[PDB]
Amino acid sequence: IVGGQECKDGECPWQALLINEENEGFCGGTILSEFYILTAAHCLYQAKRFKVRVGDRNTEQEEGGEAVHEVEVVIKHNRFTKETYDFDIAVLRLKTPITFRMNVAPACLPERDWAESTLMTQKTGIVSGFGRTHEKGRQSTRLKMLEVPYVDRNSCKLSSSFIITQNMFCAGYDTKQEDACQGDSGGPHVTRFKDTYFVTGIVSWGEGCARKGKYGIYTKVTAFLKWIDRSMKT
Amino acid sequence: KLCSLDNGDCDQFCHEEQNSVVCSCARGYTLADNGKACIPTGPYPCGKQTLE
Numbered sequence A: 001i002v003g004g005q006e007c008k009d010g011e012c013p014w015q016a017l018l019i020n021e022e023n024e025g026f027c028g029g030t031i032l033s034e035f036y037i038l039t040a041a042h043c044l045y046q047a048k049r050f051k052v053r054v055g056d057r058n059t060e061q062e063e064g065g066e067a068v069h070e071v072e073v074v075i076k077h078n079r080f081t082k083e084t085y086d087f088d089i090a091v092l093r094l095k096t097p098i099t100f101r102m103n104v105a106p107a108c109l110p111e112r113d114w115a116e117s118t119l120m121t122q123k124t125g126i127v128s129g130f131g132r133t134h135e136k137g138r139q140s141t142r143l144k145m146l147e148v149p150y151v152d153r154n155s156c157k158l159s160s161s162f163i164i165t166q167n168m169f170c171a172g173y174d175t176k177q178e179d180a181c182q183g184d185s186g187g188p189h190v191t192r193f194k195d196t197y198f199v200t201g202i203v204s205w206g207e208g209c210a211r212k213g214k215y216g217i218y219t220k221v222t223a224f225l226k227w228i229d230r231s232m233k234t
Numbered sequence B: 001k002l003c004s005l006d007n008g009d010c011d012q013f014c015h016e017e018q019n020s021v022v023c024s025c026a027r028g029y030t031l032a033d034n035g036k037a038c039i040p041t042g043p044y045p046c047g048k049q050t051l052e
């Protein structure tokens, strides 16, 4: 995350972190239930073996609420392709259930129609992760969150060198130096409504981070709600 | 304007059926008696920042 602020105690309980064999995060995820994690399909190409850590805000200290989970099933969307980054979505089923507590809780899955009319029309969304804090720098050791404006679909399509499909949406700033970045991929994009947060996107990609005239591209979760429902049974 | 008018007064999901507003909630919530508010059934309901 470029810009934004730290997630304070209990503020981003649905954040999950995909860790590799060397025990370091390479992608994010969102807790959907005690057994399921929502992430980007392109992240499954970032490590031969990985686990999921939850309840962590500082990778340098043992805050006591951390819990690592082994993955039992990886459900990648069969239509995903790195050529277009279309259908950048996957669901992970954990071997053991996540026990909810301070800093460990699920984000709400909304209904498509309501989400697209009410949530995605809000001024902003919230993205978070342990990814880079600058395009040319290192991944953060602290969980960050950033309020990102929903961007006009036309505007964003004009701003992109790559095709923004119907499964993607833009969020972020034209010039302001705040954006998600490498490492936040797969992480949560939620929208707050009456103090309840609903998953609205998955950090997917972007041409750099916080670059002038470029936006963060996210997987449009409302287009995969039926797919997610079904995956959460496999 | 039903659901367009302040989310039909629903805490969460809003549906327009027969020019009437119908509220509903996310999994883990129970629609309150007023048919508008959503009540968490158990501890750590979805979408809520943790306090304890």
Ligand SMILES: CN(C)Cc1nccn1-c1ccc(NC(=O)c2cc(C(F)(F)F)nn2-c2ccc3onc(N)c3c2)c(F)c1
Pocket (backbone or CB within 6 Å): A082, A083, A084, A085, A132, A134, A135, A136, A162, A163, A179, A180, A181, A182, A183, A184, A185, A203, A204, A205, A206, A207, A208, A209, A210, A215, A216, A217
């Ligand atoms: C693979 N080809 C075919 C390119 C392509 N085709 C369609 C889309 N893309 C595509 C374009 C840029 C990227 N390249 C990044 O995605 C990237 C590189 C870096 C850096 F740091 F430079 F290495 N950081 N990212 C990144 C990751 C998640 C993000 O979320 N929001 C953001 N702005 C953002 C930015 C990509 F990952 C795919």
